[PDB]
């Protein structure tokens, strides 16, 4: 695979682990373009940047040269040098990204950095067979039911479902306008299905 694969879905339908997955056994590495919005929204808080203050947010982005590192265990994203992963997936973050990733500074900032990584690699989001990377060979939708989605969720937060679920469905709601499926991308419900399943389904395709 020397060109581009893409996959998105809403939130908790298995974009990460699938794509972590899918690249290693790809050889190629994996972008997590949520993990960039999820900083720009972390960042904006601990500098106490009003979220509608654009420019603002760009001049720190920026300023402070954020950056996303690919590695095969997982994606990583450094500001000023320094690795900011381990605040990025918290409940306070996943409340508050929704409100950042929809100024359009921000999306230009996010996809110039995945722009800059030469292909090829596996790119997950929520537009990354839309906006981005429209030219991706292989394109996958990944979605399952809300509830399933919220009880993944629930073993990777310090919350129980049905606040999970609250506050997904209202995330994935915030999310509409940059959601939409590719009209190429297979589009897979990943409800009931294991990791390993996923994978193996989604690398069977790219290897058709
Ligand atoms: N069939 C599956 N496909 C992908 N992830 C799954 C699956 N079943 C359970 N999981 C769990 O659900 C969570 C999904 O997280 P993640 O990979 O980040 O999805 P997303 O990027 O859509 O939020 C992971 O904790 C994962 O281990
Ligand atoms: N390409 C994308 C990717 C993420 N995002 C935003 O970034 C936030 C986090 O994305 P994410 O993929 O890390 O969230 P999860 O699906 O991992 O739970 C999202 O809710 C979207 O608002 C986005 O607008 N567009
Ligand atoms: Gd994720």
Not at 109 to 135: C, I, S
Not at 165 to 177: G, S
């Given at each position: 695979?020397?060109?581009?694969?893409?996959?998105?879905?809403?939130?908790?339908?298995?974009?990460?682990?699938?794509?972590?997955?899918?690249?290693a056994?790809?050889?190629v590495?994996?972008?997590?373009?949520?993990?960039?919005?999820?900083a720009?929204?972390?960042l904006?808080l601990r500098?106490?940047?009003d979220?509608?203050?654009?420019?603002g947010?760009?001049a720190?982005?920026?300023?402070?040269?954020?950056?996303?590192?690919?590695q095969?265990?997982?994606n990583?994203?450094?500001?000023?040098?320094?690795?900011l992963?381990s605040?990025?997936?918290?409940?306070?973050?996943?409340?508050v990204?929704?409100?950042?990733a929809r100024?359009?500074?921000?999306?230009?900032?996010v996809?110039?950095?995945?722009?800059?990584?030469?292909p090829?690699?596996?790119?997950?989001?929520?537009?990354?067979?839309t906006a981005?990377?429209?030219?991706?060979a292989?394109?996958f939708?990944?979605?399952?039911?809300?509830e399933?989605?919220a009880?993944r969720?629930?073993?990777?937060?310090?919350?129980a479902?049905?606040?999970?679920l609250?506050?997904?469905?209202?995330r994935?709601?915030?999310?509409?306008?940059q959601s939409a499926?590719?009209?190429?991308?297979?589009?897979?419900d990943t409800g009931?299905?294991?990791?390993?399943e996923?994978?193996?389904?989604?690398?069977?395709?790219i290897?058709?």
């Amino acid at each position: 695979m020397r060109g581009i694969v893409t996959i998105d879905g809403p939130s908790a339908s298995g974009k990460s682990s699938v794509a972590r997955r899918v690249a290693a056994a790809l050889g190629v590495p994996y972008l997590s373009s949520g993990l960039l919005y999820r900083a720009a929204a972390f960042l904006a808080l601990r500098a106490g940047v009003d979220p509608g203050d654009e420019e603002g947010l760009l001049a720190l982005l920026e300023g402070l040269g954020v950056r996303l590192l690919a590695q095969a265990e997982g994606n990583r994203v450094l500001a000023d040098g320094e690795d900011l992963t381990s605040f990025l997936h918290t409940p306070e973050v996943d409340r508050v990204v929704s409100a950042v990733a929809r100024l359009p500074g921000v999306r230009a900032w996010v996809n110039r950095r995945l722009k800059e990584v030469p292909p090829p690699f596996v790119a997950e989001g929520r537009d990354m067979g839309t906006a981005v990377f429209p030219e991706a060979a292989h394109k996958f939708y990944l979605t399952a039911s809300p509830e399933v989605r919220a009880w993944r969720r629930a073993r990777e937060r310090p919350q129980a479902y049905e606040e999970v679920l609250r506050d997904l469905l209202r995330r994935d709601e915030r999310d509409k306008a940059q959601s939409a499926p590719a009209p190429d991308a297979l589009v897979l419900d990943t409800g009931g299905m294991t990791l390993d399943e996923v994978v193996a389904w989604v690398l069977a395709h790219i290897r058709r």
